[model samples]
Target: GTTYYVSSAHGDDANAGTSENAPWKSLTKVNDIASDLGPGDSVLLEYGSEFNDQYLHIKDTAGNADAPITISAYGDADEGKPVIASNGVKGSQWEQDYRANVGNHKNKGTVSTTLLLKDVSYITVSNLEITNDDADVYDPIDTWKWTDTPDSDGTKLDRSASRMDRTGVAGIAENGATMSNVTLDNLYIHDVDGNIYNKHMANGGIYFMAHYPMENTSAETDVWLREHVSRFDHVTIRNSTVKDVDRWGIAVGYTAYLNYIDANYGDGSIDDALIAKYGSTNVRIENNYVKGAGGDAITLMYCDRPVIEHNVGDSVSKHINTQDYTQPGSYGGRVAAGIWPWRCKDPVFQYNEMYNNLNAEHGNGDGQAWDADYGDGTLYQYNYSYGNSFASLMICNWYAVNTTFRYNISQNDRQGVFDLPSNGPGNHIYNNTVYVDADSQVLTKRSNSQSLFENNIFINATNTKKTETWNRGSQNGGQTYDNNMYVNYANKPTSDANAIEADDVSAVLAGAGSAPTSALKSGAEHARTGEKAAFDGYRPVAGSKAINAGKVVSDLNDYAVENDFLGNAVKGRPDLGAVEAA
Candidate 1:
């Protein structure tokens, strides 16, 4: 129930640490007595001060739900935020020794996180800056050498061979511990330079990995891990900016079980490795701005009911450089996306803006602005994407079912409007606005993905060279195209076996024409101004064919929202393409 102050400039470790005058000097002093910090206790770092070297590890602490411990800056809000900059200026790196010999990993290594919360619950971290700008120890001594441990299943170890780096600012609970109710708000996490060769080891700006024990464990720890699972729940990270991270910008869940092993070779149960034994649920990531992330900007994996909204990501995967490392084909030797959910159920991604996201050359996946991969009931609406290298939206993986893409805006994309493959089931793609340049196709169906496309507007700008609109490949079932307005599309929808009814109109207004001044602008512009911009403007002009020419989709799965993207009521017949003309 007390408040402790930490001042790096003017404070002594021997002081009582209860007031500003008698504050603790360093994070070491705080960790020395972290056991004494119980429920309702608060720790405040002095603003405008920076702590160099060591990490602020909050471990083995518990706070009640009603009285959670709060850790934040203490000075004036206008002052600079307190920073935990781990540059390894201290005598020794933060190290953790282990007991297990599985995976041929080292018993101990340096701690990579600037601020780490392990097995701690009911905590709030806000108004701080965390950065690891120093060159990490990536030698074979520090990296995870996997040569000594062969997979018990006798799987080939060509790509899964040797040395992984570790670095992140995260809340991790392993070996049967449960970390819950953690919130990080208004924090700036930047310059986390992790191992580019190894992704699963360590590399996330803000992450939560709650899974079974596999890496960094001892023989004694193995016995403990077999009996328990790591669980992270009720996590919320909002209003933060994570920039210039080497690997993942904001990643969750575990990909450790991709290499499954059994007790026949002193490993744990194979069932634990098959699926996520840890329970990660009720996670919300919103209102964050991510720039220059090395890999995926935001990825939700193996969780339940996760919601990601109102985030802005720009230039996410452009940081992957093969010339930087000796081994270019190391761990994450591929590209990533701006935001997507994987293996999650009922995940919702809405009101986000992603632009200028690029991947490696000819990247297979993760190059899109957003995607629904291996998930069910995934919903992406009210989003805006521009100038992405790959398609604006990518729908892939067979496990992704019943996904919905509506009210989204794509403008000036290079690859195409939508790059959908037949790996998944049919999806509902409706009411979206695809303002494509001459270089991009409107739709590229890579495989047999059955989709019902309706009430959308596809416009190829003036001086378009390539004329094909639907670049069709091997498609499976009936792909219906109806009530869409296409201008300058060379290959329009025809009376083929897969094509359905479609009203194609030419020369829709090139600009935002005829809409009233009260009509809202594109969400893409509003995103830069830091507001909740909806898909509003770009309504059809008077005598334009896009008005009232759409079919009523409200009865289809009750898919109608009460209001249009601009909060205008959709009482009468809905207009085509996202906005209501009424």
Candidate 2:
């Protein structure tokens, strides 16, 4: 239990570093005591100081839930937070050694980290500004075994080129270590010049890895090295800003734990207890703002019961398309999304705003605002999706089952309202309000599973012929649709037996109670504009078909949603859309 102070402006390395008056000078001095940090330890960097070209590496440090090691800022609110900057040129030797130990040495690009934690637990990092953007894109022949190097036409050799693996905060857990109770808050991480390649999810603003440990350790871990895997528990990242980054905004958890679980426990036996024992648990990503990422914004994998809420992801998927490869200097991928989860279980996403995600050539890949991929019991509720390049939501992968998307608003999204690449059974889509413009397709692709959509509202403001109401593709066994309201929809599915098709939809949308008029009159320009609330105008009138016009959805293998989007209690029969009536 100690307090160490660091100040680059008015301190020397020879100082005691125990008090603000006798603070240390450099990051090296602070890192010198990394091994000595224990429970209740605090390392405070001075405000209004930039530790340029310096980095902090904390390894093998442990603390308890009661008293965690804290890395924070000191001094009054005079200037910006204590800044940590890197040119993204250092830490090459560390990367090589790490790759050698992890046994993946193919994509040998430049890598660097401004704040790194290795095999640590119970740590808190807060109130700091970190940046790493100084190197050129590096795509050599080393990535030959990784991605297809040359273009599919055999013209460009470095079509899979990449930038440096630059990051702000990274935690690497190895050696079967159970890294737990890490909290990151109020940190602004930007301009992390990481690669935009699809395989480089490791490069980003804030990332964590359950890495492969070296075979030989001083503690003799080679005996259990082949079978052991690292895991995380009780990790929370909140109120942070990760802007102008690459690949991803904030990512956590690893897929290796699933492989370990398949070997030890039964495959597909991903309960909460098994997830906590194998992958990640008690995760919370809340109240964060991510903007201008070169790939997807916020994502997690192999998590159990994680709750993500109140996050605003804006203008992401900046370089996710292969159109950047035409310039040759910028070779990025062609896939990414906004907020998503992979191989997770029982995760909930709510009350978030995702908009203006761009992909130059949207195809089978993702440019959607929300994606439930390879997950079980995933829920998307009370969220806002608009202005994305592709669809508003995607139910993806062969095993994404029991995903419930309810009480959300999608306004003027392109391509479609839903993209179902793959899905399993027990997937329900209900109580959502959607507004599609002339350029927006009603259905991009179709789901082949028995998942159903009900009690929803779809309004097409244009007479476009291509915007079919049902799943337009030739895929077999598309999602079942029933008890939904459609306006200006020319092609209703055969399964919509209780559908309410209305020509005077605007009149019905004008509820008996007065409400805000936001997205109803929005044009094509409204999609990529406006951060304001655009979901208050879709409530139905008292005598409209949207009132008590749908069946009870909760009775069909789902949780009982007790309230509407506006917090109205559900009385008897359920409404057909996001809003309930008296």
Q: Which candidate number would show the highest lDDT if scored against the true structure?
A: 2
Clashing pairs in 2: none
Query: Residue 261 CA error for candidate 2 (Å)?
Result: 4.1
Backbone atom clashes (below 3 Å) for every candidate: 6, 0
- TM-score per candidate, in order? 0.80, 0.84
Where model 2 places Cα greater than 4 Å from the true spot, the runs are 91-93, 96-110, 135-162, 198-201, 215-227, 261-274, 325-333, 360-364, 445-450, 463-469, 472-476, 510-534, 555-557
Instruction: Give per-residue CA lDDT, model 1, range 1-582, as digits (tens).
Output: 889999878878889999878988888877777766789998999987788885677877878998988889997777799988875344223454322332333334554777778778999989999887655322111121223333222322112123333344777765466678999998998877655444444465887765455554578855666546576678899988887676688887643322232223221111322333433678899888877676778888766668898888777764343323334432335657778887666678887878767653434245688887766667788777777777888777455556788877777666677877764554788877777776567765353465668777776664643356453644445356776766655555652232222233332432532222111222122421124433334555566666666677742323455555554676655667766664
Minimal lDDT window, size 10, model 1: 137-146
Error (Å) of candidate 1 at residue 235 is 0.5
Least well predicted 10-residue stretch by lDDT in candidate 2: 520-529
Model 2 TM: 0.84
Model 1 residue runs over 4 Å out of place are 88-111, 135-168, 213-228, 255-278, 321-332, 360-365, 445-448, 464-466, 469-471, 495-537, 554-562
